[PDB]
RNA sequence: GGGGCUGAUUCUGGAUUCGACGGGAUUUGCGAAACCCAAGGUGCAUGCCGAGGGGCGGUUGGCCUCGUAAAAAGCCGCAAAAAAUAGUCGCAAACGACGAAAACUACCAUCAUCAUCAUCACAUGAGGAUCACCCAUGUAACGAUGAUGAUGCCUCUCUCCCUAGCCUCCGCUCUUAGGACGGGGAUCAAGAGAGGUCAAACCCAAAAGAGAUCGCGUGGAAGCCCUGCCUGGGGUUGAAGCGUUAAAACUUAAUCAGGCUAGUUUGUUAGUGGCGUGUCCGUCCGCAGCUGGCAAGCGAAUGUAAAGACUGACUAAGCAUGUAGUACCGAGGACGUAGGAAUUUCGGACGCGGGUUCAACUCCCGCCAGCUCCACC
């Protein structure tokens, strides 16, 4: 599959601390992913009932109406999840999506880092 | 109404590795319920009439509760957030104001210097020169303007003045000047304090210093510690007066160390009489109390308590009743077992539901959803 990074991570954003997370789209949709129809202009992820959710990220289709216009969840740790919103407690940290990238079974992640960027 | 096309890009098997994501399940823990073993307290019981307060929701099973008139939890129901590399910082500030053209002059009740600018006179120059003049610079002399300083001249208001009973001065030497008992006078630069676009001012009130050499010395009595008796060496307070300048006249207190008698207490023993928490009994009997006798201590001693059980009779508690009814409570070791902890762990993110099956898009089977193409319209 393809590997995407973000266009300015390194440019006016400094990361303090980094994680990486798994994302659920549907297999469909990473069957696409996995042939590159995909589009990463101005994502984002916001937090909604203890989890992360990208709002922002387009993966066309390859069937029926399968909507692939919905937002997506990304998974991370019980405790340290639930914890790293109190990191951001302090005074604020963004959250940045610094790379997507495929594992070695051809399923997707996101690294993220905790940044002093604006 | 139809004609068609389109639906796991790990090759059969836990694996959508993972992504402490969310159920399910064991190992392992405490609340909860039950047992094994040790272990202490408790009067128990059945039954509850009435009264005041009382309001939903967000957090608590939306009524608490109690004892002869108040013993009886409580708040709220409403906005959010920070710094320095190819770019970039929205928009945002409160400070007031003017000028006028022509002529004279002072008493010493302020007085005095110095600084500047114009001028004459005495005076030099181996300075000069347009030739009776120009110029550095020493001495005398008039003038206006500006800063700066000072004990007084003045003027006004004013602390009582003169005298003195009493009287300092002194261990001793050495060195002074006067005040407020009493009285009389309509309050003076013989003394100060203040002012004129200017400045300075300490006679007055209940006595001092020094010759270093004790920073008030020197002098004396009485009572006393024991004290129940005995050994034991040595210490002080209450009080008075002498010495130079304010002139005193009796009163009661502070440590103990060691040994012990009479005398007395305790343990022990005997005994009259006392209390004994439900009232009444009694058997187990406890405790002090006080006399007589013994054994000991005489700074390790005269400090305070009031029962523990049962065979019996009559039986209580908030109110009523059953009174031989009957049990309630509580802590600790240890064998299990629920959403606490660790872990094998399944779904995982593959259109949507069936079967075969050790699992299935790959092995079978339905239906949807979309587009494209005939067509009433």
């Keep these: 599959a393809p590997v995407l990074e973000?266009?300015?991570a390194r440019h006016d954003y400094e990361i303090l601390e980094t994680y990486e997370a798994g994302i659920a789209l549907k297999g469909t949709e990473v069957k696409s992913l996995r042939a590159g129809k995909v589009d990463f202009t101005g994502s984002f992820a916001r937090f909604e009932d203890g989890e992360l959710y990208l709002e922002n990220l387009y993966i066309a289709p390859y069937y029926a109406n399968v909507d692939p216009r919905r937002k997506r969840k990304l998974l991370?740790?019980?405790?340290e999840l639930r914890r790293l919103l109190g990191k951001v407690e302090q005074k604020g940290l963004t959250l940045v999506p610094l790379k997507i990238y495929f594992n070695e079974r051809g399923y997707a992640k996101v690294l993220l880092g905790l940044?002093?960027?604006k």
């Design 76 to 79: 991370l740790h019980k405790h």
């Design 115 to 117: 940044a002093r960027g």
């Design 6 to 8: 973000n266009r300015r």
